[model samples]
Target chain A: QLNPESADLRALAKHLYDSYIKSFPLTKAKARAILTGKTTDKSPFVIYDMNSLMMGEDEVAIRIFQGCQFRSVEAVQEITEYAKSIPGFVNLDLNDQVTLLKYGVHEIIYTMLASLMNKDGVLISEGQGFMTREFLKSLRKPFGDFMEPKFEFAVKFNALELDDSDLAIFIAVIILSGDRPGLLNVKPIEDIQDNLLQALELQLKLNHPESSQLFAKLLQKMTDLRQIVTEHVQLLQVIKKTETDMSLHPLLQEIYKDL
Target chain B: ESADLRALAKHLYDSYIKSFPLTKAKARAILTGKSPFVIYDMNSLMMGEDKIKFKHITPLQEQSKEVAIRIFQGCQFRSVEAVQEITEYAKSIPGFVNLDLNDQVTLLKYGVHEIIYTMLASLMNKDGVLISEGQGFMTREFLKSLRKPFGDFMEPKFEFAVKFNALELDDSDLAIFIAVIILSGDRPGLLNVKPIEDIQDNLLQALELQLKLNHPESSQLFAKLLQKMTDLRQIVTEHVQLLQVIKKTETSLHPLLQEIY
Candidate 1:
């Protein structure tokens, strides 16, 4: 159990609050005032219960990111699993999970992002692949300077080390930094894949010594994926092509691309 | 010309057996390439897991002490009339936990008359990869047919009826799937319909020829269709005991298995 009253925990809380406030960069007075309920503005944030960071309930896994809580090993694992279960997580790795989590749980952010994703959850299947509906809304949310706080609480006292192969915590980092730099907002297709690839690669190399072999496999899978994704991307062209080509169907057609 | 064709058909019908010394070349020709034109209606290889080698819970298949232990361990009891008493009573029994989790699930599925589920469960071990059987004719029609048995207190009746829908047991589903496959895998062959189609074609030709005559040779044609239907049903009836044995053996399939279906 986490002790809210204890001095050490209080210090941790203060540290988190400081980083949290810094990220938002409102006046510490404004942040406190907001918490004190003086500000009429409803803070569009979710307070994640911390018990779920450990093995709590089987059902709670479904809501891993509906709120925010103290990051831990179990929390990270659950996050990765939940995100991967989505239609597209495996293809993007740690970076994409963060953006989706940040945008997904918040009805406000989810609406904004889902609109940007192609106005539907499907981004990849459409030529709308490079840019999601969510990205469009971020620019739509009014272009202005905003706060960027580092919740180093995860970095310092996080249950798993930064070097762990667990991609979930890494994803949590991306989620926490939602609507911020280096999360999404990419242009060149090569640049986007490379950026996400390097970030994932850095984690892999740091965690697994034999990551090169795995990296080779990931590279091949990504290449194959890119090739196949060209065929069914939500573009009008792919859809037309898919229909005319019997191979795309699941019958006596070529199945190499099915995986 | 029709007479000559009829004579040729009668001659070839008797001689094709001796004409080929090997399996029919036409049957082998079913695979032109990826198109399995003729579905082989055959079973895959059977697989199983390492059975736990433990002392008999009671004595034999039904009489086992394990059954009692399973009941005891299953859910924590709040206020028991007797804990040790229950254990003792269960100890006197033959089967404990009634075939363990794996087989219990399989029987529940089998009892529902899910032939695919039954067969798939046969291949699964207590712990193994999952296997999903390709759904055949049963499709979604069977679910709609169960409105009678599940109407009482079943909420959202149709959905509730389909509830407890087994996960397509992946390969593990076959743990029982293969057993059913082994049990009622084959169907009795019906006489090839190719000849029926051909004869009917000839019958049409003969009928056309008969049309030029004064009266109908309708008796001959009626006799042909009638005999064909009878033959089809006869072959079907004679060969159909395959399902009866399955249902019969299933009557005692895993005694004490009362919850399924």
Candidate 2:
């Protein structure tokens, strides 16, 4: 059942992901450097409709909200592709596989967003464009409240300090959840989840031998993920009412509609 | 419209009683299918406990696997019975059974738990749940006392049931609500999503009209009922996590739970 080729591919996919995060600026240092045009590193971050801000227009906040929504979808798509490449993942019933991906991508994306956060706040983009908790609260009610719980969780989860391989296994565990409605091959999906959990247990034992409760703690965090993601969707459902002009991406609209 | 739905709901409850009953004819029907399983008349297991109903203020902590197995398996059986009733009732609803067999099974597999919880809520009072018809109610505290994973499993659901009971929904409302739950379009992997959605919208219209005709004083009943489905999702999320824990710890799983949960 174990595929070494898949495992190797998982390693490469995860490494590419980690490197992407590693280059992410965690403070204002790189963001300011890039703004000054002194850095060789490219900026993947751009805030749409911010030119109105330079002209003292009230549209700046709406633009930022739109930008955040767009970036969130990009993050979700990237992770979805990464999950698709996992060995045996594509081999599952296509419908069941997509069901898992759709149900889980929001949960997994927020967890990824957690990586960009520190105790102070999270960076919205690759540059040092850090958003402090207080500043996020100032944006707008729904948008601010949506970002609030994410940082609170990210701060606590980042403290767990799991390495990329641990995350790879957990991401696999998330994608392989048998509990998603309409799974056709539940047994095999469950078998894969159990195997991933076992791998995570063994890896945790070797990697952090003295942290006795880490595995259970991580499992508890999955429940927490469900809670926060549910809140995020709840927020979107409410906010979408006030957002009549700008359109939400279809993927996001469907996510809200489903949940 | 009203008479058919009321009759359908009545038949569902009647079949549910027979499907998992202490009754004679139903017991005979089981033996007819499987030669060896026999029945003997005995007092309800809760007979003594019901007399001294408030015996325990705290939850009963179930330590034995046999006891845990009996409790969880009993629950699994009850859920299966509930599903059978739901299947029967759904078929009675127009256009529901006309859907492809895969769509029917898909809707049932995904939507059954929400219906089960809705029914279980109806079965509860302030004190506890009625596990066996007319035997007695199983106290929420007692359910909370069951051994690891199972105790934790039942608690959130009991809490939900208590809150749901406060809504004071009756059988007809439940009948229409159950229809809405089953015909949900967003249920993953539906083969005919549009037709299911059409059925769902019709069910919603029927439910709203009935709620208006029946409970004129209760404004927003339809909205509140729809909101309960959201709450139902949270309960199921917790329930699924507990199922995962049970899977990890237990060497064997009850086959019925494997199917439903």
Candidate 3:
């Protein structure tokens, strides 16, 4: 019956929470402290270094970009690990697992990014520093344009005030999406997604009973993430055509290539 | 076989009980004109709970265009609040949260008035309807005193309310019935009609079984309730037209109502 209070869902939500913490340890509270200067981190601010890219000294720019891609690859790996921890995820066909991850990784990453985001900017490098909207805009061309929509999405998503537990089931719901292309089997994936969704709804209701529309708003965000990822892929294609000198990490290339 | 329906009905009933908590004293106050009364137009009644002061309406003040505008504004504010409550109630209905966002909106857009009218039956009597959670009561005569189509709107609703109240449905029955109304597949512009139809079928079964258990000896009560659903559709259609007429006048509709209408 998918009762939220049932033993099955309680255990599933706990596993998802544990998995989510294992993958992304930085909490929204910690991120906010760093961004607001209430706390400090050992890591230093690391910008994209657009000045180096513009002056034909592409070394720093390329390295920073590569660093970002490497971090994204690590995040994707963590997402895969987290997916394995979900109750029914590992039982799916191996190819279905790969297909789901390939399409779903970016959306999950953006969902996590909301924790480090505020209205004006996002924290980067594990909350070591903040990047303002104007600073990202100064990068111009494809890079700046690609980031704008994500920041917009993050700001709005952050307003929903989802904690890590709420986010855990949400990530599972995203990964088990049946609409992803080229799945060998759909029904099993949908069944899993439905269970996660019911759990997520119960979690939200318990956590945010006053905000009655929060569940609907979160579902709408999943739709919005798909559009953002679509535009992101298109912009990545533009970068592929124009930024010939820069290289994409092999893992990111594989993820983007199929898209 | 009927266990799922029973569970679903109980879930919806709990949701309704949580969402609306009008006490017996409050209902009695409204029915007997004993609570602190406020004219619908005299106060905005949309702001904080303590900010409003109650005022009685005079016969001369009841029929003016100015009073009509204030009443319309009051209703708009209440309508906005009702939409929120109804939205929360709808989301609690099993399978409702799974429908596409557009489909959800379509169903609410077409169905909210029916749900509103259904709930209004609780606050109404043969003489008039209560407004603003017993803060005011608009007598049938006061409503009919407003000029032309604006005056004509509530008569049909009053007529319907009188008949619907005769069904003697409680909160649980109204909860499941409202779900059936919101999940109707016949609502226009629904992209996913089949799932809605399926959910509505389940709700219908639940509602029928509920009525059978609750209204044991009211023969043909289930059939009459379905007929009332049709009657609600006609009332809402006319209500929309009357609102359109008000729209053409100097009265400004609330933005939420404007968008929905």
- CA-lDDT, candidates in order: 0.27, 0.63, 0.72
User: Better model by DockQ, 1 or 2?
Assistant: 2
Cα displacement (Å) at residue A65, model 1: 18
Model 1 lDDT tens row, B135-211? 11111222222222221111222221221122222221212122221121011232232332233344333332332
Winning candidate number (DockQ): 2
Worst 10 residues of 1 chain B by lDDT: B41-50
True contacts kept of 2: 0.00
**Clashes found in each candidate (C-alpha, N, C closer than 3 A):** 57, 1, 0
| Per-residue C-alpha lDDT of model 2 across residues B60-120, encoded as one tens digit per residue | 2342235554567567655766677777777766688889889999999888887787777
Instruction: Compute each candidate's TM-score over C-alphas.
Output: 0.19, 0.48, 0.49
A18: Cα error in model 3, Å? 0.9
Better of 2 and 3 by lDDT: 3
Task: Give the Å shift of residue A82 in candidate 3.
Answer: 1.0
In candidate 3, stretches whose alpha carbon ends up further than 4 angstroms from where it belongs are A1-5, A40-64, B1-261
**DockQ list for all candidates:** 0.00, 0.02, 0.01
State which candidate has the highest lDDT: 3
Clashing pairs in 3: none
Question: Tens digits of per-residue lDDT for model 3 on A1-259?
Answer: 5554566677778888887888775766677667766744543363444552344232333454566678788888888888888887888999999899998899898888778777676776677655666666655456667568888888768878888889888888888876576789987987787678767767788788886446645664664577677777777778778888877778888888766
**Model 2 spans > 4 angstroms off:** A1-58, B1-233, B236-261
